[PDB]
């Protein structure tokens, strides 16, 4: 059926910056004002900020304002504030005289703007206890960095690994607005004991930081 799509998927603005999020509807909304803007924080239920395309709800700060027209709808944050950094969804209602349907957008993260910060990179060999179960996990930690984008590559005896790693990323820290990232290389104990040099290469911008260890040297 219908679908919604907003702009962008994620952005970065400052406290006091002017933020603009647009939203495009697959069709024309059934009722003309069948467009709402939802603000959802991590671990919290969605909160409707604006309904009827442009009408603000009571208690919502007036710095928010929706300016939709046809199939293009804009959420405006005049003076962005610390409590405004969140994920924003637009939702539209479109059916017929014998249909009634909704669809959400994909979302839009309004992230804090931060100066570049390089990660503190740590590599962790698999524990001896885990190796007894037949599987080896090698963990690479990227602590308190910015921006989020980063290339983390695993090397085993200088051989670039492919398809045996999984990444996880935290949300922006509430104090320094940095990210933390983990990359976990999964090998069998047999394959782990076949090689010597395990290295985690972290590349962002013009710098690559490689932390490594020899299997057995401690």
């Amino acid at each position: 059926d219908i679908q919604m799509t907003q702009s962008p998927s994620s952005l970065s603005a400052s406290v006091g910056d002017r933020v603009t999020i647009t939203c495009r509807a697959s069709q024309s909304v059934w009722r003309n004002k069948n467009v709402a803007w939802y603000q959802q924080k991590p671990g919290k239920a969605p909160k409707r900020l604006i309904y009827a395309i442009a009408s603000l709800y009571s208690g919502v700060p007036s710095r928010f304002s929706g300016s939709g027209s046809g199939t293009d709808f804009t959420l405006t944050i005049s003076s962005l504030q610390p409590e405004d950094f969140a994920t924003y969804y637009c939702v539209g209602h479109y059916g017929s005289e014998n249909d009634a349907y909704y669809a959400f957008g994909q979302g839009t993260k309004v992230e804090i703007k931060r100066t570049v910060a390089a990660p503190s990179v740590f590599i962790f060999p698999p524990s001896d206890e885990q190796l007894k179960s037949g599987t080896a996990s090698v963990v690479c930690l990227l602590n308190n960095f910015y921006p989020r984008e980063a290339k983390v590559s695993w090397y085993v005896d200088n051989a670039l690994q492919s398809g045996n790693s999984q990444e996880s990323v935290t949300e922006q820290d509430s104090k320094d607005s940095t990210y933390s990232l983990s990359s976990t290389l999964t090998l069998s104990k047999a394959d782990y004991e076949k090689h010597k040099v395990y290295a985690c290469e972290v590349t962002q911008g013009t710098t690559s930081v490689t932390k490594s260890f020899n299997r057995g040297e401690c």
Binding site: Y51, F122, S182
Partner: protein, 216 residues
């Protein structure tokens, strides 16, 4: 005061059925139209269906297969019943009057429905830091592997150590089991004296693991 509370929810084995009630208070369940929405872990809001004021169901493409959105005015409930549940159906299900073209919008708190093949407590392995190579700061942590279903909560020193802790979102390994790590940065000079213990709690299996993380 208007209120919308969500009943049901919990562990459902695959192919089984979930039944979720949505009890209203302060108004009548037949005087507005109501939707069912769901949010998968880390994913976006996804509309399921909408029951108009006239008791007319309007499911979604993927939902029309196995979804029945009924209404019971006797008990002031709107109900959602899904059959043939897959792993993609593990999510937080809400009931709501979405409030697109009306001043009245209300949501429930959301109840979690988890599709589980098995219940498996976690295995906790140390991320050991002495030989620290980052000056006066060392990193250590706990690797929480092979558990199902979500979630696990991790604290450090029973909550007496919260500064610098980073507990990563769980990832679904190709084996079908979840895994995550919890890390913390500490003075590299404190390693020989200060004790560092991660407290892993997995309520779906009634398991709690406390792990001392030591150097080397």
């Amino acid at each position: 005061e208007v209120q919308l509370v969500e009943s049901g929810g919990g562990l459902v084995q695959p192919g089984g059925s979930l039944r979720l009630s949505c009890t209203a208070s302060g108004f009548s369940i037949d005087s507005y139209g109501f939707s069912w929405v769901r949010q998968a872990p880390g994913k976006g809001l996804e509309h399921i269906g909408y029951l108009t004021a006239g008791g007319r169901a309007f499911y979604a493409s993927w939902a029309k297969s196995r979804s029945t959105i009924t209404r019971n005015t006797n008990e002031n409930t709107v109900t959602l019943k899904m059959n043939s549940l897959r792993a993609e159906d593990t999510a937080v299900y809400y009931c709501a009057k979405l409030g697109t073209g009306s001043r009245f919008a209300i949501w429930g708190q959301g109840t979690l429905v988890t599709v589980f093949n098995q219940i498996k407590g976690p295995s906790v392995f140390p991320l050991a830091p002495s030989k620290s190579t980052s000056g006066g700061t060392a990193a250590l942590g706990c690797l929480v592997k092979d558990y199902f279903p979500e979630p696990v909560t991790v604290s450090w020193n029973s909550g007496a150590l919260t500064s610098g802790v980073h507990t990563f979102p769980a990832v679904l390994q190709s084996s079908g089991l979840y895994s995550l790590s919890s890390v913390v940065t500490v003075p590299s000079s404190s390693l020989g004296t200060q004790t560092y213990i991660c407290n892993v709690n997995h309520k779906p299996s009634n398991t709690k693991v406390d792990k001392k993380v030591e150097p080397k």
